[PDB]
Write an enzyme that holds these catalytic residues in place. Structure first.
Site, PDB file in Angstrom:
ATOM      1  N   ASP A 113      93.854 -22.308  74.263  1.00  0.00           N
ATOM      2  CA  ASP A 113      94.202 -22.967  73.008  1.00  0.00           C
ATOM      3  C   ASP A 113      93.980 -24.475  73.077  1.00  0.00           C
ATOM      4  O   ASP A 113      94.257 -25.101  74.099  1.00  0.00           O
ATOM      5  CB  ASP A 113      95.664 -22.690  72.656  1.00  0.00           C
ATOM      6  CG  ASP A 113      95.810 -21.838  71.410  1.00  0.00           C
ATOM      7  OD1 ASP A 113      95.375 -20.655  71.435  1.00  0.00           O
ATOM      8  OD2 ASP A 113      96.353 -22.358  70.408  1.00  0.00           O
TER       9      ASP A 113
ATOM     10  N   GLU B 105      88.761 -22.251  72.254  1.00  0.00           N
ATOM     11  CA  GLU B 105      89.317 -22.261  70.909  1.00  0.00           C
ATOM     12  C   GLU B 105      88.948 -23.647  70.386  1.00  0.00           C
ATOM     13  O   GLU B 105      89.602 -24.644  70.703  1.00  0.00           O
ATOM     14  CB  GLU B 105      90.840 -22.093  70.926  1.00  0.00           C
ATOM     15  CG  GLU B 105      91.483 -22.134  69.540  1.00  0.00           C
ATOM     16  CD  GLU B 105      91.901 -23.536  69.101  1.00  0.00           C
ATOM     17  OE1 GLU B 105      92.806 -24.106  69.743  1.00  0.00           O
ATOM     18  OE2 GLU B 105      91.335 -24.071  68.118  1.00  0.00           O
TER      19      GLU B 105
ATOM     20  N   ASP C  46      97.659 -17.030  64.090  1.00  0.00           N
ATOM     21  CA  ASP C  46      98.223 -18.143  63.317  1.00  0.00           C
ATOM     22  C   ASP C  46      97.872 -18.066  61.843  1.00  0.00           C
ATOM     23  O   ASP C  46      98.417 -18.817  61.036  1.00  0.00           O
ATOM     24  CB  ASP C  46      97.747 -19.500  63.844  1.00  0.00           C
ATOM     25  CG  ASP C  46      98.284 -19.815  65.222  1.00  0.00           C
ATOM     26  OD1 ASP C  46      99.493 -19.609  65.476  1.00  0.00           O
ATOM     27  OD2 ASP C  46      97.487 -20.283  66.055  1.00  0.00           O
TER      28      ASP C  46
END
Ligand SMILES: O[C@H]1[C@@H](O)[C@@H](O)[C@@H](O)[C@@H](O)[C@H]1O
Ligand SMILES: O[C@H]1[C@@H](O)[C@@H](O)[C@@H](O)[C@@H](O)[C@H]1O
Length: 497
Positions: free
Chosen positions: A290, A337, A392
């Site tokens: 991330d 990401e 998300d």
């Protein structure tokens, strides 16, 4: 158009005892995946969670989430006897899961100490010895956290906060049982995941893991290695992670996560990251990270600042780090990401090392044909992963329902150009999954909520919302062969089988 997989955090699996676990339902999902033509199973970070239950704010960058331990095998051995507290269905009740599963695991630990075979007592012994480098600090961390009413480590008595040699040994001696318990939870977790991993490999399925680039402030590794992070003498972050104000957020975002002292990690040959990746590769075949942009540069925010406005960019040693990773593993099984506001520098780093980026279809229709998320703009090498939406994002059906007039209309016209048409609203998730598989992206991954075309109530995480996150669960018998067959069909049609 190589393959496709599904996104489902283990907690979402159906099953008794309050949450998805690494047991039979999990193995069942593997068969489903196999028979559906899927070759990948993506999950969210698997470490222990704290308040908020977020997988991205774990109490440890190495530990395993005890909540994922399947208690059934332990029941079959006579180590513990279980009684249901009234867990709901289709969602995880974390409050209840906390009050119940910990004592449940603790009880099972006593059964183990009194009925474990020698081969079991011996394995548990080998494990504790081999994982000691991190297990020792983790177990004591959790134990001390319980012993202090859940207070964060940098709020504990000076002696313990600063990890004084004596205080540690004493605490480590008068709580050896609790410490052993936590080690026990870890032993079970890794052994149970290991079994599941071999299972997936035999079925020809790879695991796509995940980890936040920044660790949580209140965690074992920050406590035991404050030299690696920008902290003051009281153990408090002098600067925190986040992103600057952009077109959307007028104040930017202040995450609060502690920032690394890159200079220190480098002098140590980036030992932390290598150890961190080595441990992840024990569980996953591919590791998504991330906020990848952080390896190029990160937005440093003064801890005293309430927003992210006062920050500034700081370059990070990305090139060196990845060069080191390349030599350490002989390859770089990382998944970048790179969503959000990315720069040419970030793309340069990502590409320079052949790392695959991400594409989210839910973000591809708020503009014109030049939107980098529209399939026709995907790089020719197709070394990218397309998603309809991630954890998300709202479910695709939920996103569609609230999307702007422009997005809804552009969606139809764009889908049309690809020979894809839809009538019913519940059809949208499939139209997009179809578009995804028809694209140049070598890999397409879809959250199970879209396979079931669920609405916004099945949303895994809602950034900004202070509750109800990470709780969605498949209900018993909700997912069926019918869905697998339809996926296989779509995968065969696009050459992903
Ligand atoms: O490496 C191979 C190659 O790319 C094939 O063309 C196909 O895509 C396979 O599934 C796999 O990906
Ligand atoms: O049935 C369950 C699970 O769904 C799988 O089938 C596994 O291989 C075992 O059989 C387990 O007991």
């Amino acid at each position: 158009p190589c393959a496709y997989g599904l996104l489902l955090h283990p907690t979402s699996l159906p099953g008794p005892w309050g949450v998805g676990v690494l047991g039979e339902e999990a193995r069942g999902f593997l068969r489903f995946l196999k028979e559906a033509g899927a070759r990948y199973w993506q999950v969210l970070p698997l470490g222990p969670t704290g308040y908020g239950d977020s997988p991205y704010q774990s109490f440890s960058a190495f530990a395993g989430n005890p909540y994922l331990i399947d208690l059934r095998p332990l029941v079959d051995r006579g180590f513990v006897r279980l009684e249901d507290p009234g867990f709901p269905e289709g969602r995880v009740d974390y409050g209840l899961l906390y009050a119940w599963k910990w004592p449940a695991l603790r009880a099972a630990f006593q059964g183990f100490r009194q009925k474990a075979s020698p081969e079991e007592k011996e394995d548990f012994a080998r494990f504790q010895e081999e994982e000691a480098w991190w297990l020792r600090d983790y177990a004591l961390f959790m134990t001390l956290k319980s012993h202090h009413g859940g207070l964060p480590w940098n709020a504990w008595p000076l002696a313990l906060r600063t990890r004084e040699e004596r205080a540690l040994k004493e605490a480590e001696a008068s709580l050896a049982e609790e410490i052993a318990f936590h080690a026990f939870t870890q032993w079970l977790f890794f052994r149970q995941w290991g079994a599941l991993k071999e299972e997936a490999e035999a079925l020809g399925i790879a695991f796509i893991g995940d980890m936040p680039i920044f660790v949580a402030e209140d965690s074992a590794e920050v406590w035991a290695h404050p030299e690696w992070f920008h902290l003051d003498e009281e153990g408090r972050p002098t600067v925190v992670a986040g992103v600057p104000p952009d077109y959307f957020s007028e104040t930017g975002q202040r995450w609060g996560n502690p920032l690394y002292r890159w200079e220190v990690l480098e002098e140590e040959g980036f030992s932390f990251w290598i150890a961190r990746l080595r441990k992840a590769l024990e569980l996953f075949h591919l590791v998504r990270i991330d906020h990848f942009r952080g390896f190029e540069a990160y937005w440093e925010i003064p801890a005293s600042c309430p927003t992210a406005v006062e920050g500034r960019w700081v370059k990070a040693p990305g090139e060196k780090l990845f060069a080191r990773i390349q030599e350490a593993f002989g390859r770089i099984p990382i998944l970048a990401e790179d969503l959000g506001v990315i720069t040419p520098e970030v793309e340069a780093l990502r590409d320079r090392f052949g790392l695959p980026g991400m594409k989210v279809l839910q973000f591809a229709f708020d503009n014109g044909m030049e939107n980098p998320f529209l399939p026709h703009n995907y790089p020719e090498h197709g070394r990218v992963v397309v998603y309809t939406g991630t954890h998300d994002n709202d479910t695709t059906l939920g996103w569609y329902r609230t999307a702007t007039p422009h997005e809804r209309d552009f969606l139809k016209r764009y889908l049309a150009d690809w020979g894809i048409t839809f009538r019913e609203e519940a059809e949208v998730p499939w139209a997009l999954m179809r578009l995804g598989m028809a694209s140049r992206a070598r890999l397409a991954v879809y959250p199970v909520q879209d396979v079931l075309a669920l609405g916004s109530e099945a949303r895994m995480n809602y950034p900004g919302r202070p509750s109800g996150n990470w709780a969605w669960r498949l209900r018993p018998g909700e997912i069926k062969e019918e869905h697998g067959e339809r996926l296989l069909s779509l995968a065969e049609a696009t050459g992903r089988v």
